[PDB]
Amino acid sequence: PPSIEEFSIVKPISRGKVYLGQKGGKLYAVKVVKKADMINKNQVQAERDALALSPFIVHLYYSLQSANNVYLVMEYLIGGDVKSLLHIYGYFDEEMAVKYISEVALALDYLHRHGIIHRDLKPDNMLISNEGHIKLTDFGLLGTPDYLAPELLLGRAHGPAVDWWALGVCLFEFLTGIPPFNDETPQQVFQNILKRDIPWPEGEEKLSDNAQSAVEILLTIDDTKRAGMKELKRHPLFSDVDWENLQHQT
Ligand SMILES: CCNc1cc2cc(-c3cncn3C)nc(N)c2cn1
């Protein structure tokens, strides 16, 4: 039963907050959750149980405690998050974006196959592993408004289709750099999500026909018709994808 004393804070890596750890010449990523929100605003033992169960999702090494704080000692991936990588490139090329989205989709499919909806999919929580494939973090069982599905907005009873909407938001944001339903106020954002106000580009920048369709099937208002993994795997944009091989590449 190791103790948090052995861990030496190096420098923060995320805004709970995520710090870069040190222990025995090893680097961990330690999330700190003070009892200010853990024991005074409600589902903490929900992110720790979705992270303990593994090959597509960030590895959780230890579950540690404190005077007020809780500590998630997870693996450290120098590759950073897709959020940062995207700011650097401005946006990804069609081939590169499909590469990441397919990896995210396999991770989503893994999660659901094990009775787990993410509910908080966004590039910020998509980590570029040391191997190169995407890993998932910040398990939220209201989150970032820009990625929430209409049913999440309307407080409806929902299913894994929320994750495919979020996936659609990221697929658009990988081709543009900007999320599709982006606006100045949070209320404005909800109107765009509900209106399905996707601002497709025009000219030399205008999105591919296979890219526009792939976003459309993911960003479908009616959750009983919206795209799943089956629809996605068979969609023409993911044609040059070997899911059998990708599953092994891990
Ligand atoms: C250099 C940056 N790389 C990095 C970032 C990490 C962030 C989180 C996390 C936990 N909750 C949200 N995030 C985003 N978890 C980890 N295991 C992380 C490992 N490495």
Residues noted as catalytic: 120
**Residue 200, exposed/middle/buried by CB under 10 A (0-12, 13-18, 19+)?**
middle
Q: Kindly list the domain boundaries of the chain, sorted by start residue.
A: 4-75, 82-249
Resolution for this PDB entry, in angstroms? 2.7
CATH code of the region 4-75: 3.30.200.20
| Through-space distance between the first and last CA atoms of the chain, rounded to whole angstroms | 30
Experimental method used, please?
A: X-ray
Query: For residue 147, what is the DSSP state?
Result: G
Tokens of 21: 């750890």
**Cα–Cα distance for residue pair 149/106, rounded to 1 Å:** 20
If one residue of 20, 58, 136, 144 were mutated to test the ligand 1 pocket, choosing by the most ligand atoms within 8 A of its CB, it would be 58
Say if ligand 1 is within 6 A of residue 120 CB: no
Phi first, then psi, for residue 98 (nearest 5°) are -60, -35
β partners of residue 136:
126
Token pair 């720790």: residue? 48
Q: What single letter denotes the amino acid at residue 33?
A: V
CA of 205 to the centre of ligand 1 (A): 32
Q: Which CATH architecture has domain 82-249?
A: Orthogonal Bundle (1.10)
